[PDB]
From a paper:
Purine nucleoside phosphorylases (PNPs, EC 2.4.2.1) are cytosolic enzymes involved in the purine salvage pathway metabolism in most organisms. The enzyme degrades (2′-deoxy)nucleosides based on 6-oxopurines to the corresponding purine bases and (2-deoxy)ribose-1-phosphate. Purine nucleoside phosphorylase (PNP) is a well-known molecular target with potential therapeutic applications in the treatment of T-cell malignancies and/or bacterial/parasitic infections. The results are supported by a crystallographic study of eight enzyme-inhibitor complexes and by ADMET profiling in vitro and in vivo.
Residue numbers in the entry: 4 to 285
The structure:
Amino acid sequence: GYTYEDYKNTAEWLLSHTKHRPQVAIICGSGLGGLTDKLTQAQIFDYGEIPNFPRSTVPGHAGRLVFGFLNGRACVMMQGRFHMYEGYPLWKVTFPVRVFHLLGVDTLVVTNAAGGLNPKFEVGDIMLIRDHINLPGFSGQNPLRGPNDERFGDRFPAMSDAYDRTMRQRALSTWKQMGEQRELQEGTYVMVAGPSFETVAECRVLQKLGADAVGMSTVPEVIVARHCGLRVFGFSLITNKVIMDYESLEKANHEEVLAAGKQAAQKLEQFVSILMASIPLP
Ligand SMILES: O=c1[nH]cnc2c(Sc3ccc(Br)cc3/C=C/P(=O)(O)O)c[nH]c12
């Protein structure tokens, strides 16, 4: 793992190298990377340049912290996030969330792409996360596993209240405020480890357990954020409808996820920029 002083060192280094003092951390899901373009007084740090900071395994598109202002909120954005299917243990995946805390961040916005399990959902829909099912966590893949540091939080923190009530209201409001043809979905995100896509039998399992969307991220970051006392809001871009019957002759693919990512780009960047106004000042 990391010692408390590895995080302190990373935080202080970043404070020594930017005048930016962020209040909101935003983790961009696959196809919301553009959102760093909306920042003003943007200062970029490649992960490779930051002490202790896991480096990306995707040489094609690498990973950056961008400090800057979004809609008059002091932000730090992660463009390129870590997943456990890449081989990172969860203490590396969620390492940034503890750095954010020590930078003085008090709010985390997490976005992801996800497959629709709720049949009412359509490709392009945004689902606000009311709740999650942490399948890896049940089995021992929980990012708080190991010694607990009281300087971060309690041994046994609650997650029943993980996704801020207030921010979810203010999000539904903001959505009405802009009108929009399709309605804003709300529901349960189930994390699976991946990286392979679900069988029909697996899809039926996740439906039966009461999940509306399934993806391979987000939940560990949420747990570590909550363990710190960060306010947490997030959502899923529904990129694909999960094949739930053997009669179907369609299959889930990387391309159709990326393509949905490119389509609903503006809408999500637009939505997240306006939501900054709805985040309390410190
Ligand atoms: O049907 C599905 N089952 C299980 N998982 C998924 C995901 S998750 C994903 C799949 C492909 C690419 Br390309 C990117 C990501 C997200 C990455 P993230 O950082 O946004 O979470 C999308 N659809 C499904």
